[PDB]
């Protein structure tokens, strides 16, 4: 991955497809991990997205991949980043119920809509979809158009959302194009791109994907990803091991206090070692 | 309310009860508002807490009351505050099913437990419970002990939580005391206080309360309150009106960009006026 090249494509076209983002054992392990949640149906509750953190670090580590961080840093012009959201989801074929197309929309907004988005600099949002099955035109491909400003459409429509009806925005639907991709490919896109998910045309099978999005902390009304966990929880061990494996630049996206932060004292270094035995505290020592 | 006096009681004892925080029409309107959600049962789904924002600003405005902000600013030593959570809840009597006591616990932790809490300065958390019914010993009073450090108990127990079992911490249960309060009273407490909810002993009726908690933005791994809303939503009008009514110091707790923030430009001032017609933009003009 060439961070500057990918960030330039995001800026100009709104999206970039990275083939072979995962290969080898990393791909095999990620596929196995997501299949623990969404097994080969060969289901109602299994249509729901499952939020981070997952039961396997073969999924948890990917939204924080150093290559992804590098792209986002180049596009936004800041290193002060946060993971906004991450989840896994399966989209099932027609044998498992009616599958519908989403409306074209942007994802430029924070969840609360507290203030209107900006599509420039540190206010941009970057989305990723890591496909863990081969995606064809009959397995619910993502559709993309272009950045909203390039298309001359507003981020807030007259209907009061970031979605574009077919009756009001016909040209968007004529220009949309599907993204087909091999398993292990990563689609990156900016939140202000006009895009949608699509219906899974095929009868059997399901599309498997890991989703995430990242924002700059300067957009302070935006929430980072919310989850609840305590050391007593059965899933804590996996998360604890994730924190030990991550480098400081990656933990930063979870809101971890950075080197030099006032949080760090002899007592909090001690408590960090207690909660995450084996963690490297040297970057944080006062 | 005397902010410095209340903050001193919070620092020394861990809690302070403010009688008559709401009086007059403000109290009557808040009671009516919460009763739209939890009517006089004279219910299963009605036992669930409902999160902010509410359908009435007679509830939404209270976690942001200037008097509450002043207390928290004095205790934490910073004005860079965020609302962590707010919700309303009813606790029903025994006629509506078995009511149980919570274990004593602290609420010193962020939801993700990402790093261990600090109970000093800007890392303190402040909780409020605004009681909207009269609370007696038979209507599920809050129980309090004292700050964890004062009691010599850890914020992380050997069980891996912030809760204190009766078998491991018997002295805490012998020292706990109920808080009785008239309707319109506000209980404030620090997150590191050992406390619990209790069973509603009475057969009929329910306790009504509005809950909120606030933290300092320096504790950057902590999440501010998460909600989803867009201008198309039926509840947007109420929230829009709330934003117009609030002063800058209050909007700050929602993550609103402060005066002088790089977010503010001619274009974003325009978009702010469009989304919140009538809002005073003068504090934010570049």
């Amino acid at each position: 991955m060439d961070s500057k090249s990918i960030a330039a494509e995001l800026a100009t076209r709104g999206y970039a497809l990275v083939p072979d983002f995962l290969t080898g054992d990393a791909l095999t392990e990620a596929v196995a991990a997501i299949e623990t949640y969404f097994p080969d149906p060969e289901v109602a509750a299994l249509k729901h997205a499952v939020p981070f953190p997952f039961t396997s670090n073969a999924l948890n580590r990917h939204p924080l991949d150093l290559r992804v961080i590098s792209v986002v840093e180049e596009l936004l012009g800041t290193t002060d980043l946060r993971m906004t959201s991450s989840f896994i989801q399966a989209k099932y074929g027609t044998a498992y119920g009616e599958s519908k197309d989403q409306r074209l929309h942007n994802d430029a907004w924070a969840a609360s809509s507290l203030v209107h988005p900006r599509a420039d600099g540190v206010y941009q949002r970057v989305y990723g979809i890591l496909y863990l099955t081969d995606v064809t035109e009959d397995t619910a491909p993502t559709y993309v158009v272009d950045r909203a400003a390039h298309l001359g459409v507003p981020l807030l429509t007259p209907e009061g959302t970031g979605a574009y009806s077919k009756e009001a925005y016909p040209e968007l639907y004529e220009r949309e194009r599907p993204v087909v991709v091999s398993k292990g490919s990563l689609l990156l896109f900016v939140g202000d791109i006009v895009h949608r998910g699509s219906a899974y045309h095929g009868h059997l099978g399901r599309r498997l994907a890991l989703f995430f999005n990242i924002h700059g902390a300067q957009a302070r009304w935006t929430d980072k990803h919310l989850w609840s966990l305590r050391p007593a929880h059965p899933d804590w061990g996996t998360f604890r091991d994730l924190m030990i494996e991550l480098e400081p630049r990656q933990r930063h996206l979870l809101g971890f206090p950075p080197p030099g932060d006032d949080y760090w004292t002899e007592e909090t270094i001690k408590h960090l070692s207690e909660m995450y035995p084996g963690i490297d505290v040297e970057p944080y020592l006062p | 309310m005397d902010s410095k006096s209340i903050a001193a009681e919070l620092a020394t004892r861990g809690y302070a009860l403010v009688p008559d925080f709401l009086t007059g029409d403000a109290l009557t309107e808040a009671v009516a508002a919460i009763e739209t959600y939890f009517p006089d049962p004279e219910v299963a789904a009605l036992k669930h807490a409902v999160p902010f924002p509410f359908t009435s600003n007679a509830l939404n405005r209270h976690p942001l009351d200037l008097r509450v902000i002043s207390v928290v600013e004095e205790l934490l030593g910073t004005t860079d505050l965020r609302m962590t959570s707010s919700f309303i809840q009813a606790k029903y009597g025994t006629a509506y099913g078995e009511s149980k006591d919570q274990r004593l616990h602290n609420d010193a932790w962020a939801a993700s437990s990402l790093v261990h809490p600090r109970a000093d300065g800007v890392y303190q958390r402040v909780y409020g419970i605004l009681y909207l019914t009269d609370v007696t010993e038979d209507t599920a009073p809050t129980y309090v002990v004292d700050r964890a450090a004062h009691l010599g108990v850890p914020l992380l127990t050997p069980e891996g939580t912030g809760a204190y079992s009766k078998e491991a911490y018997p002295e805490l249960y012998e020292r706990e005391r109920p808080v009785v309060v008239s309707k319109g009273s506000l209980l404030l407490f620090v997150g590191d206080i050992v406390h619990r909810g209790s069973a509603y002993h009475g057969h009929l009726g329910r306790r009504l309360a509005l809950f909120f908690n606030i933290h300092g933005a320096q504790a950057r791994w902590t999440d501010k309150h998460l909600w989803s809303l867009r201008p198309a939503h039926p509840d947007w009008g109420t929230f829009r009106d709330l934003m117009i009514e609030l002063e800058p110091r209050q909007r700050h707790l929602l993550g609103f960009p402060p005066p002088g923030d790089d977010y503010w430009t001619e274009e974003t001032i325009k978009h702010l006026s469009e989304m919140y017609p009538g809002i005073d933009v003068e504090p934010y003009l570049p």
Partner: peptide, 15 residues
């Protein structure tokens, strides 16, 4: 809908 938090007008939503 098909998420884990808030509501999309049907059930819990992606956030």
């Amino acid at each position: 809908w098909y998420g884990w938090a808030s509501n999309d007008g049907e059930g819990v939503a992606i956030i």
